[PDB]
Amino acid sequence: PMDDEQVLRHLDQLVNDALDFNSSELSKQRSEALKYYFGEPFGNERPGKSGIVSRDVQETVDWIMPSLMKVFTSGGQVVKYEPDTAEDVEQAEQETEYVNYLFMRKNEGFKVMFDWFQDTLMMKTGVVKVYVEEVLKPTFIRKDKKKREIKVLCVKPENFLVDRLATCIDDARFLCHREKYTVSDLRLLGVPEDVIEEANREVWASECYTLLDVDGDGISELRRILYVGDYIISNEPWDCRPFADLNAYRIAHKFHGMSVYDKIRDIQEIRSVLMRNIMDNIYRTNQGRSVVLDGQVNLEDLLTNEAAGIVRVKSMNSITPLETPQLSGEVYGMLDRLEADRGKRTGITDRTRGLDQNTLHSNQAAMSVNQLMTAAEQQIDLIARMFAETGVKRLFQLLHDHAIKYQNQEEVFQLRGKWVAVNPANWRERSDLTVTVGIGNMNKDQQMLHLMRIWEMAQAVVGGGGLGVLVSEQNLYNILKEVTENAGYKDPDRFWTNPNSPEALQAKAIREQKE
Amino acid sequence: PMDDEQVLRHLDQLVNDALDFNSSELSKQRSEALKYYFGEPFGNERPGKSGIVSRDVQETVDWIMPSLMKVFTSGGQVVKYEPDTAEDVEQAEQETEYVNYLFMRKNEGFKVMFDWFQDTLMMKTGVVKVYVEEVLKPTFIRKDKKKREIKVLCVKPENFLVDRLATCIDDARFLCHREKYTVSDLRLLGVPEDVIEEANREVWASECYTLLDVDGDGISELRRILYVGDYIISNEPWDCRPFADLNAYRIAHKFHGMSVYDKIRDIQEIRSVLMRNIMDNIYRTNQGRSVVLDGQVNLEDLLTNEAAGIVRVKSMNSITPLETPQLSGEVYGMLDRLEADRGKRTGITDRTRGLDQNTLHSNQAAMSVNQLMTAAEQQIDLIARMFAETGVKRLFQLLHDHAIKYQNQEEVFQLRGKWVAVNPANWRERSDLTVTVGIGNMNKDQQMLHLMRIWEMAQAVVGGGGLGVLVSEQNLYNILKEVTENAGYKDPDRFWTNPNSPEALQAKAIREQKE
């Protein structure tokens, strides 16, 4: 009760414990993963012997990346909102388009997404941070004054201290983010002095989000602490934790899920060892192994690698050359099946290429149905599913961070017009169904089913029954509209609109009726 | 506060530190990469033995480059602007066409692109510089006076000193560009004397962009310093850093990403060593290995390579010819799989040729499902995506450097007419979606989807329902226009225009109606 200084030492103890445990365990694991990625020697390499390291996780990561980038960083259809039925286009489409228009094309593009995916595929966990800024440009043309802008950035997960007893983002009792916050930022804040650590002195700082009870009452809500160097700090009650902490594999109820390294390190080790064994055997066979006596053949055949062929001994005549057998094709088959198993584990794409020109393509129905059921239930779809379900958290965080107070800014969603974004609703609910393992039909198959099926259905309806009783121009416009949705030229490039529009009244009620 | 000379020594210390660190680390890495590219010996070659070096990164670079040039240096559709909806054609198309028309066909063409791509693929980072000039030709015909012309040039990244704590272009506190700026330029500037270093004395100079506080106040904005030789300098507050600093692989939060060498050096080493072993074994088998005594066979078989067949001994009769086994067929497969893995890493194009005449072609739907999902999610697409997302910064830099003040010059965008380029808006936003991993359908498949799908849809609508209620001639014009978009004959070579034009009124309201 009424704590002002013991909170500092308590936070210092928590930060020190987090540093020790996180550093030891996670730093060891991530250093191993990074060394494996860059083909660093494992330590078992022998002097005077080849240190061949077969990079195996590099290709796996570089082939996981394009699928996720194609499925996510293409359009603003990744997440919907699905509000109450009557009021949907008023805000849900507007808010979804706003958050898409500000996450993309407004916040470093998808570079944050690329770094986030590397963090979640490499350091076993990828987390970003959403913060706010203030634009006060005194350009009296574009006088964008009092612009409480919102930015999202990756946090370099080595500086993402958190207790182990969380197992979720909104379950930790303490989150620490280590930043620099150089002397310029401190001077802007207003502190008069410096700490132990030219105007810029590369000082270090930290930010703490934790729930405590400092008001002499029960446990209060989250508090934000600008604990820099045990000095002037900025304490303030907070509302929500701005982090997203992807894990990419969803292990059982522990916070940090495993990464690609944690399941392909054995494959990389086996491949590197077997490659080294093969090339060592080849080098030994070319060089040759022989036994020589002491006092004779002292020249050791001049390392036996001289391009002369003359050996010379002394006076003896025997020499014992031993034979090292050559490896057969079974080792070649071992390499082939090892690569096949490495692919089958996560990168189930075979050779990641389609330059088989002799091969043909044939379809029986439903487009070889769904390309053989999405290449037999690709794991990539599940990975994208959980990535979307965890980016729901960051999208909701951005929605709140704008709904509190952002600006009077507009959008370009197929038409001008968007009011101030400080009075939407949170809706406390999001949906990412249109991406992945759910209904979530991939655009190429969704458009196939839609276009083909619904088109013959509509043509049969029009020919047989009539557009009056059954599907009308209003609905046919829909079918064409989602056809263009799959085509990408939705509203302005091909209007086709005719819901009930002034030009449509003359088009329908005059020419189509009085003809 | 009020610093006029300590800034010189501070900048000198920063430049010296940057020289030391950048030189050591990056010069070592780039020298290794360059030696690997030109097939230089690795240092392990033996005297009297073949120094065969299998050039492996040359073909990889020569395969990466044409795809980049095809996808980028073809048309001005790489980057759009997407402004507020109502005012789009007024400036967005105009400014986009202007920046394309001045970058291409006006600034050395794409030779800057070629050098920039070499810099980003060889030295692990490619960066260009954007500056302004002043042409004052007194030709009184084409009296082009006050030509504040913007020029972009590659900077030979060995002269791109920058601190390591940036991890981004707009994050470094100090950028140094080393130039020559010969005595002619110094005399033009107005300095009276020379430095330690014929009128031309090949003097050395440097340019510094850094933020400091020299006005006795808080940390100010960026400053440009013409620090040449610790002499008369040109200090001036600046606004933006004109650099683009591609990295081509987007490693985690560090400035310099890896290069092709950094991930194919192991493959090149393995291939060179294994090929050298093969040819050494062949040469040894042809030459032969034999053990001879001392005092007899003094002629060492005349190097055993004489085309005579007569050996001669002395009196000894035995001779011990040892046998070096010939390499089996598994090494052939080892070379095959090594080449296959080298391709699968980055150069996934197999042999980069299509002379498989016995092969055929067949399509089931969606153009062989988008040519097997773009040849199974080509890495080239992701490389182009990041290249465009990084060149967005360069395009914005050009837009700013032109919107400040350039000239009253015009364009040839499908029609004459373009006003002064000093009063556009920056729009603070760019889009490169029409190129790459996003929606970004490559022209050949976008055209297929558009033309085919939309065309049977439109014919079905016209035959069944009628062009009145649904799509009319106005939107059918767009249907044809985006079809002709893919061929290059967009506006004037096939007009078809008929939006609402004086000829269109007679064409439609008279002949098509009163018939």
Separation of CA B230 from chain center? 35
* Alpha helix stretches (DSSP H) within B250-365: 260-287, 330-345
Show residues of chain A in contact with B332, CB under 8 Å: none
Starting at the edge strand that comes first in sequence, how are the strands of the sheet with B174-179 ordered?
B174-179, B205-211, B222-225, B236-237
Query: A55 CA to chain B: closest CA distance, Å?
Result: 9
DSSP tag of A214: -
What is the CA B92 to chain-centroid distance, rounded? 25
Report how far apart, in Å, the C-alpha atoms of B259 and of each of A123, A246, A499, B32, B263 are: 21, 28, 54, 12, 7
C-alpha atoms less than 13 angstroms from C-alpha of A133 in its C-beta half-sphere: 13
Q: Breaks in chain A, named by the residue before each, with C–N above 2.5 Å?
A: 140, 197
In chain A, % helix, strand, coil (3-state, to 5) comes to 45, 10, 50
Burial B361-386 (b: 16+ CB within 10 A, else e): eeeeebebbbbbbbbbbbbbbbbbbb
The Cα of B448 is separated from the nearest Cα of chain A by a number of Å equal to: 11
Q: Are the Cβ atoms of A74 and B440 closer than 8 angstroms?
A: yes
- B295 CB burial (10 A radius; 0-12, 13-18, 19+): exposed
* Interface membership of B422 toward A (CB under 8 Å): no
Under 8 Å between Cβ of A515 and A509: no
Within 8 A by CB and 6+ apart from A244, the residues are A116, A126, A127, A128, A169, A390, A391, A393, A394, A397
Within 8 A by CB and 6+ apart from A30, the residues are: A122, A123, A124, A158
d(CA B180, CA B128): 16
- Which residues in chain B have their C atom more than 2.5 Å from the N of the next written residue, marking a break after them? 140, 197
Please enumerate, as own/partner, the contacts of A82-85 that have beta carbons within 8 Å and a separation of 24 or more: A82/A427, A82/A429, A82/A431, A83/A425, A83/A427
A172 and B CB contact within 8 Å: no
The verdict on a CB contact (< 8 Å) between A358 and B363 is no
| DSSP-based three-state secondary structure for B302 | helix
Q: Which of B392, B398, B379 is nearest to B432 (CA)?
A: B392
- Continuous segment of H or E residues that includes residue A207: strand A205-211
The token pair that represents A230 in the structure block: 């045990």
Q: Which amino acid is at A475?
A: N
d(CA B233, CA B212): 16
Kind and range of the H or E element at B129?
strand B128-132
Q: How far is B337 from chain A (nearest CA, A)?
A: 9
Smallest CA–CA distance from B270 into chain A, residue: A52
Interface test with B, best of A139, A141, A357, A415 (most B CBs within 10 A): A357
Q: How was this structure determined?
A: cryo-EM
Residue contact B369–A361, C-beta within 8 A: yes
> Residue A130 CA to chain centroid, in angstroms?
16
Q: Do A371 and B371 touch (CB under 8 A)?
A: no
Closest C-alpha among B89, B76, B120, B92 to residue B434: B76
Q: Which of A353, A292, A275, A287 is nearest to A324 (CA)?
A: A287
Measured from the Cβ of residue A307, the count of other Cβ atoms closer than 10 Å reads: 15
C-alpha atoms less than 13 angstroms from C-alpha of B292 in its C-beta half-sphere = 22
Q: Which residues contact A240 (CB under 8 A, 6 or more apart)?
A: A222, A397, A400
Structure-block tokens of residue A45 = 């390499």
For tokens 């660093």, the residue is A40
Q: Which of B24, B80, B41 is nearest to B273 (CA)?
A: B41
Structure tokens at B4: 């006029």
SS (H, E, C) B422-465: CCCCCCCCCECCCCCCCCCCCHHHHHHHHHHHHHHHHHHHHHHC
Partner-chain contact A360 B360, CB within 8 Å? yes
A310 contacts B304? CB cut-off 8 A: yes
Which residue of chain B is at minimal alpha-carbon distance from A454? Answer: B457
- The answer to whether B89 faces chain A, any CB pair under 8 Å, is no
Residue A310 Cα, gap to closest chain B Cα (Å): 6
Measured CA angle at B425 (ends B424, B429), to 5 deg: 135
Yes or no: say if B172 and B166 are a contact pair by the CB < 8 Å rule: yes
CB-CB contact of A117 with A68 (8 Å): yes
Reading across the β-sheet that carries A236-237, which strands appear in turn?
A174-179, A205-211, A222-225, A236-237
Dig out the tokens for A277 from the structure.
């064994």
Is the alpha carbon torsion for A459, A465, A467, A469 positive or negative?
Answer: negative
Interchain contact B425–A (C-beta under 8 A) = yes
Q: What are phi and psi of B308, to 5 degrees?
A: -125, -40
Q: How many helices (H) and strands (E) does chain A have?
A: 15, 6
Q: Of the candidates B403, B81, B98, B91, which has an alpha carbon nearest to the alpha carbon of residue A412?
A: B81
Element at B176 (helix H, strand E)? strand B174-179
Q: Are B465 and B410 in contact (CB under 8 A)?
A: no
- Tell which residue, A386, A407, A324, A352, has the closest CA to residue A106: A407
Which string of DSSP letters, residue by residue, matches A121-149?
A: HHSS-B-EEEEE--B----------SB--
- Minimum distance, in Å, between the CA of residue A156 and any CA atom of chain B: 7
Q: HSE-up of A143 (CA within 13 Å, CB side)?
A: 4
User: Could you tell me if A281 and A324 are in contact, meaning their C-beta atoms sit under 8 angstroms apart?
Assistant: yes
d(CA B437, CA A66): 8
Structure tokens at B181: 């700026």
Return the number of other C-beta atoms located less than 10 Å from residue A165's C-beta: 11
Cβ–Cβ contact A290 with B under 8 A = yes
Through-space distance between the first and last CA atoms of chain A, rounded to whole angstroms = 86
What phi and psi, each to the nearest 5 degrees, are found at residue A399?
A: -60, -45
The partner residue sitting opposite A507, judged by closest CB among B46, B461, B469, is B469
Closest CA to A292 of A283, A304, A280, A306: A304
User: How far off is chain A from B347, nearest CA to CA, in Å?
Assistant: 10
Contact A487 B365 (CB under 8 A): no
Please report how many Cα atoms fall inside a 13 Å half-sphere around the Cα of residue B244, on the Cβ side: 31
Please check whether residue B437 is in contact with residue B385, taking contact to mean a CB–CB distance below 8 angstroms: yes
Q: What's B487's DSSP letter?
A: T
Residue spans of alpha helices (H) in A288-422:
329-345, 366-377, 379-404
Give dist(CA B412, CA B301) in Å, integer. 80
Residues near A475 by Cβ (< 8 Å), separated by ≥ 6?
none
Angle in degrees, 0-180, between the axes of helices A473-487 and B454-464, rounded to the nearest 10: 170
- Residue B69 burial class via C-beta count within 10 angstroms: exposed 0-12, middle 13-18, buried 19 and up: middle
Q: How far is A466 from chain B (nearest CA, A)?
A: 11
Structure token pair of residue A34: 């990074």
In eight-state DSSP terms, residue B327 is: P
To the nearest whole Å, the CA of A500 is away from the closest chain B CA by 10
Q: Is the Cβ–Cβ distance between B383 and B345 less than 8 Å?
A: no
Closest B-chain CA to A477 = B470
Rg value, chain B, Cα:
32
| Residue that is written with structure tokens 């989250």 in the block | A222
Nearest to B348 by CA among A333, A421, A63: A63
Instruction: Determine, for residues B273 and A279 on separate chains, whether the beta-carbon distance falls below 8 Å.
Output: yes
Sort B138 into a burial class: Cβ within 10 Å, 0-12 / 13-18 / 19+: exposed
Give helix then strand counts, H and E, for chain B: 15, 6
Q: Looking at the complex, does the CB of residue A459 fall below 8 Å from at least one CB of chain B?
A: yes
Do residues B275 and B51 lie in contact, with contact meaning Cβ atoms separated by under 8 Å?
Answer: no
Longest CA–CA span in chain B (Å) reads: 120
Burial label for A42, CB within 10 Å (0-12, 13-18, 19+), is middle
**Residue B487 touches partner A, C-beta closer than 8 Å:** no
Measure CA of the first residue to CA of the last residue in chain B; give whole Å: 86
Q: How many CB atoms lie within 10 A of CB A335?
A: 19
Q: Which residue has the tokens 């952002």?
A: A406
Contacts of A286 in chain B (CB under 8 A): 277, 280-281, 284, 324, 327
The gap from C-alpha B369 to its chain's centroid, in whole angstroms, comes to 29
> What are the residues whose beta carbons fall under 8 Å from the beta carbon of B81, sequence distance 6 or more?
B91, B92, B95, B96, B427, B429, B430, B431
Please tell me which residue of chain A has the smallest CA distance to B283.
A307
CA distance B281 to A350: 35
Chain B contact for A39, CB < 8 A?
yes
Alpha-carbon gap, residue B110 to B73, rounded angstroms? 7
Structure tokens that stand for A484 in this block: 């263009």
Backbone φ and ψ for B320, nearest 5 degrees, come out as -110, 90
- Dihedral, CA of residue A278, residue A283, residue A287 and residue A292, to nearest 10: -60
Nearest alpha-carbon partner for A100 in A388, A409, A398, A414: A398
Which three-class secondary structure state does DSSP give residue B239?
A: coil
Q: Do A69 and B325 touch (CB under 8 A)?
A: no
Q: Is A6 on the interface with B (CB under 8 A)?
A: no
Cβ-Cβ contacts under 8 Å between A and B: the total is 282
Q: CA A487, A492, A494, A496: dihedral to nearest 10 degrees?
A: 120
Residue B19, H or E segment: helix B6-22
Cα A307 from Cα A309, distance rounded (Å): 6
CA nearest neighbour of A8 among A175, A166, A229, A186: A229
Burial B1-24 (b: 16+ CB within 10 A, else e): eeeeeebbeebeebbeebeeebee
Q: Which residue has the tokens 């504040």?
A: B148
Of B511, B449, B442, nearest in space to B479 by CA: B449
Report the C-alpha dihedral over residues B78, B79, B85, B90, rounded to 10 degrees.
Answer: -90
Stated as kind and residue range, the H or E segment containing A111 is: helix A111-122
Query: How far is Cα A276 from Cα A355, in angstroms, rounded to an integer?
Result: 30
Question: Please, are residues B374 and B455 in contact by the beta-carbon 8 Å criterion?
Answer: no
Question: Six-digit token pair at A499?
Answer: 């819901």
**Alpha-carbon dihedral sign for residues B434, B438, B444, B447:** negative
Structural contact between residues B167 and B256, judged by C-beta atoms closer than 8 angstroms:
no
Structure tokens at A347: 């990168």
